[PDB]
């Protein structure tokens, strides 16, 4: 029954931040392409005292589309991912999934 306290602690912890980048994320329609998603994710990585770890896949799809994943080194850890036509696009959609996972997480 410990992990109930763990999941509530993590929800309160990543709702306890005071970043304006999170508010800019929340109000903006995040289906927009104008925002620098990988760079903003690195900014929030430097902001909230952890490592964003971009790791590519070693195995392309049956459709030949590249896959990337993002490790959000919190306690517990977030894992997000993206699949894009390039490694840049796979990392872009992976950093995207990281940001709506935070927006899902930071919605108070």
Partner 1 sequence: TVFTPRDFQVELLATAYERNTIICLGHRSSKEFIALKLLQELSRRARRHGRVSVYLSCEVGTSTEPCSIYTMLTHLTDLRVWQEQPDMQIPFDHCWTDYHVSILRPEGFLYLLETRELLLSRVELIVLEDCHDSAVYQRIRPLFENHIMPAPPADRPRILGLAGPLHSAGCELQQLSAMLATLEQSVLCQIESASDIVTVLRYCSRPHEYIVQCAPFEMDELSLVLADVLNTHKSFLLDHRYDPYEIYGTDQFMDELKDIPDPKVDPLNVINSLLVVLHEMGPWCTQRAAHHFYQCNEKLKVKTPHERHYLLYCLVSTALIQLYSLCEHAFHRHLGSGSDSRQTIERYSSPKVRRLLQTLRCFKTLCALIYCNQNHTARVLFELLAEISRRDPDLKFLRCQYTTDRVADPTTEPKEAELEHRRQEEVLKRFRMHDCNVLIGTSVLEEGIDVPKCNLVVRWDPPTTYRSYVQCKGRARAAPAYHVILVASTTKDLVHQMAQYREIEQMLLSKCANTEPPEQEQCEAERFSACLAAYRPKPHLLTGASVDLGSAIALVNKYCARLPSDTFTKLTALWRCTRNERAGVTLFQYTLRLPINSPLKHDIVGLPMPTQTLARRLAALQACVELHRIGELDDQLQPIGKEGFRALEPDWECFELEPEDEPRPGTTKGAPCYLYFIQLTLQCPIPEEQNTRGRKIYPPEDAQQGFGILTTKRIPKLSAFSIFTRSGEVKVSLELAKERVILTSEQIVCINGFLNYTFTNVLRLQKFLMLFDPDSTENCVFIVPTVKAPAGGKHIDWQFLELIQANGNTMPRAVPDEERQAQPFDPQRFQDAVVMPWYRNQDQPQYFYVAEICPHLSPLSCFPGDNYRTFKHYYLVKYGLTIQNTSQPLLDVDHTSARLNFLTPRYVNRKGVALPTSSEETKRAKRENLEQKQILVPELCTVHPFPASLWRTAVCLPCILYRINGLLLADDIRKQVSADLGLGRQQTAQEVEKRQKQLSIIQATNANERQYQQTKNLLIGFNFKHEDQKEPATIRYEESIAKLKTEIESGGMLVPHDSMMELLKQLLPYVNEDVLAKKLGDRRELLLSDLVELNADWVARHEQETYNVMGCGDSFDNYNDHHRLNLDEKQLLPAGFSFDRQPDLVGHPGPSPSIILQALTMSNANDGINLERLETIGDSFLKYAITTYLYITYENVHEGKLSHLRSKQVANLNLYRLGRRKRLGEYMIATKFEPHDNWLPPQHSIPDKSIADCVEALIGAYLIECGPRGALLFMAWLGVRVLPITRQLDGGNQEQRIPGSTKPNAENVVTVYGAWPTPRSPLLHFAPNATEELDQLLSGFEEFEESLGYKFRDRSYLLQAMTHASYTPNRLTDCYQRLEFLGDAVLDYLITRHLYEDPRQHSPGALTDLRSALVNNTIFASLAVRHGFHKFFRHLSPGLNDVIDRFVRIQQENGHCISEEYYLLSEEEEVPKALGDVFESIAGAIFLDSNMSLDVVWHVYSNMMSPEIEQFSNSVPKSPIRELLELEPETAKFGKPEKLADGRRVRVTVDVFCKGTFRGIGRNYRIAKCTAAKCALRQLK
| Given 9, 10, 17, 43, the residue binding partner 1 (CB under 8 A) | 10
39 lies in the site for partner 1, by CB under 8 A: no
Alpha helices in the chain (DSSP H): 2-13, 20-27, 37-47, 87-106
60 lies in the site for partner 1, by CB under 8 A: yes
CB closer to partner 1, 1 vs 49: 1
φ, ψ at 67 (rounded to 5°) = -125, 135
CB closer to partner 1, 37 vs 93: 93
Tell me how far apart the alpha carbons of residues 17 and 10 are, in angstroms, rounded to a whole number: 11
The DSSP symbol for 98 reads H
12 lies in the site for partner 1, by CB under 8 A: no
78 lies in the site for partner 1, by CB under 8 A: yes
């Amino acid at each position: 029954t410990q992990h109930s306290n763990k999941v509530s602690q993590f929800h309160k912890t990543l709702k306890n931040a005071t970043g304006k980048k999170l508010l800019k994320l929340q109000k903006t329609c995040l289906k927009n392409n104008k925002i620098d998603y990988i760079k903003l994710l690195g900014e929030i990585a430097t902001e909230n005292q952890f490592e964003v770890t971009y790791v590519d896949i070693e195995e392309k799809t049956f459709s030949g589309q590249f896959q990337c994943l993002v490790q959000l080194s919190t306690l517990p850890v977030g894992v997000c991912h993206g699949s894009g036509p390039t490694a840049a696009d796979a990392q872009r959609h992976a950093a995207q999934n990281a940001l709506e996972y935070l927006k899902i997480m930071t919605k108070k």
